[PDB]
């Protein structure tokens, strides 16, 4: 699907 | 999809995506996205965290934001604006879909928001700035 979310 | 896309608009908190590309002139694989944020709210918004996700063929990267809060709106003065850069590697030129997770506090409530962005400029034209 998609990867995990990404932070700063 | 060259024009600025409204990614988020509630409680008077707006987040737009602005489109560009870099850094080898030669290349057309990485999209630069400046995400700008304004508030019209009467109570200030603090503790803003914007996350993002993409499909496995792409890659997303979030640079630190110019800030983490916005004041109560005071229409008399220049508005405050948060600005954040994010870079979207997509060398396979596959369809563009992004999923954000927005977090912020306003007064005594804490909004945990999620949404989909699909209005990206087609990967072909990433070379053209």
What is the rounded distance in angstroms from the CA atom of residue B87 to the CA atom of residue B61? 5
Given resolution (angstroms) = 2.5
CATH: 3.40.50.300, 3.30.70.1380, 2.60.40.1230, 3.40.50.1370. Which one for B1-129? Answer: 2.60.40.1230
Tell me, letter by letter, the H, E, C secondary structure of chain B: CCCCEEEEEECCEEEEEEEEECCCCCCCCEEEEEEEEEECCCCCEEEEEEEEECECCCEEEECCCCCCCECCCCCCCCCCCEEEEEEEECCCCCCCCEEEEEEEEECCEEEEEEEEECCCCCHHHHCCC
What is the rounded distance in angstroms from the CA atom of residue B9 to the CA atom of residue B51? 16
* Ramachandran quadrant class, B87 (left: phi over 0; alpha: psi -120 to 50; beta: rest): beta
Cβ <8 Å between A8 and B56: no
CA A6, B14, B34, B79 torsion: positive or negative?
negative
Cβ <8 Å between B61 and A4: no
Most A CBs within 10 Å, among B37, B54, B85, B98, to test the A interface: B54
The structure was resolved experimentally with: X-ray
What is the rounded distance in angstroms from the CA atom of residue B52 to the CA atom of residue B47? 16
Domain boundaries, chain B: 1-129
Cβ <8 Å between B99 and A8: no
B113 forms beta bridges with B102
């Amino acid at each position: 699907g998609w990867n995990s979310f990404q932070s700063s | 999809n060259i024009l600025p896309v409204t990614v988020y608009d509630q409680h008077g908190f707006r987040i737009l995506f602005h489109f560009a590309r870099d850094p080898l002139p030669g290349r057309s694989d990485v999209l630069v996205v400046v995400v700008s944020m304004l508030s019209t709210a009467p109570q200030p918004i603090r503790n803003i965290v914007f996350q993002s996700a993409v499909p496995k063929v792409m890659k997303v990267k979030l640079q630190p934001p110019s800030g983490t809060e916005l004041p109560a709106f005071n229409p008399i003065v220049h508005p405050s604006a948060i600005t954040q850069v994010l870079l979207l590697a997509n060398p396979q030129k596959e369809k563009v879909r992004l999923r954000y997770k927005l977090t912020f506090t306003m007064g005594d409530q804490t909004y945990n928001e999620m949404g989909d962005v699909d209005q990206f400029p087609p990967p072909e034209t990433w070379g053209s700035l």
